[PDB]
Amino acid sequence: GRRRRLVWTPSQSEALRACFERNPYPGIATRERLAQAIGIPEPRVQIWFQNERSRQLRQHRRESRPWPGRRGPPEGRRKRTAVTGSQTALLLRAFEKDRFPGIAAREELARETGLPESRIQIWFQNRRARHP
Amino acid sequence: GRRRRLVWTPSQSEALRACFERNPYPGIATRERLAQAIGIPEPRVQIWFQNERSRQLRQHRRESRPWPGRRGPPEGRRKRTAVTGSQTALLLRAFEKDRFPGIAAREELARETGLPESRIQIWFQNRRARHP
DNA sequence: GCGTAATCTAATCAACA
DNA sequence: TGTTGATTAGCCCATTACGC
DNA sequence: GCGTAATCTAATCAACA
DNA sequence: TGTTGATTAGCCCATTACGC
């Protein structure tokens, strides 16, 4: 069971497109600034940019048009989430049970740990990658 | 269980390519003439030409080069196989049991009917298409 | 069924102990 | 420096499944 | 796993009753 | 003319699965 996909409003989609033309590699500050402007969580904005770039990369390559890329200084990343030893212990127990937690499983770990669900999702991605 | 694919010899592949450059839409006479020259049944030759054309069509389209097509008068088709009423009755019974007979099932129908297995395969193709 | 948000892997950047 | 959280790309014309 | 023979559908040509 | 045997093409850049 994956996350119930969300439906952008017309005005939300315009703000995403506009900010994407301004800079298609926004930092955490930009994303949070946009997230708060349009009323959806920053993790959703991050995903949209990742998908939009992938959509644009696929298109520029079909048009045989070169892809501009990272224009301007790279914006600041997210702060490296600090995860305590106990928080880790819960993820390890959740991981041996199910490597692929759904949105239901992830959202409960975010209660049992206090970690943002978005970060828990990334933790499992990295874990699955580094522990076959 | 599908037919055990066959492996062309180098000299067989050259004769196929050569005849394909001569005419990529050979009639039954040409195919049988080539089949007997290289030592594999005409149904195999027919399949090869059908696949080779499909391979060539996919390539010319990637190269943006136009596909020549049927050059010269169209060569004669195969004689419309005559199928008796009893032969049909066996195919209908085999069809209600299994719409997708394998090579094992088809090769036995060719004994129980006297029809070429290649024609039995075509019969099922047409039947499945016209009787959902 | 289409559009695409959600998801995934493999690699690489990069903070922190 | 190792570990691990963070970010990014993802590359083309029926489909299926065997022999090599 | 790659190359591709084997297979498939949907449509269309075409013989025969 | 209907039925059915015969022949041909097959159309593009991570994958999955939901909301519309």
Curated annotation (Swiss-Prot), chains A, B:
Residues 54-84 are annotated as: Disordered. Changing residue 130 to A: Decreased DNA binding affinity. Changing residue 77 to A: No effect on DNA binding affinity. Isoform 1: Does not seem to be expressed in normal muscle, but is detected in muscle of individuals with FSHD, and also in testis (at protein level). Isoform 1: Does not seem to be expressed in normal muscle, but in muscle of individuals with FSHD, where it may be toxic to cells. Isoform 2: Detected in skeletal muscle, fibroblasts and testis from healthy individuals. Binds DNA as a monomer. Interacts (via C-terminus) with EP300 and CREBBP. It is linked to Facioscapulohumeral muscular dystrophy 1: A degenerative muscle disease characterized by slowly progressive weakness of the muscles of the face, upper-arm, and shoulder girdle. The onset of symptoms usually occurs in the first or second decade of life. Affected individuals usually present with impairment of upper extremity elevation. This tends to be followed by facial weakness, primarily involving the orbicularis oris and orbicularis oculi muscles. Belongs to the paired homeobox family. This is Double homeobox protein 4. The chain holds residues 19 to 150 of 424 of the full protein.
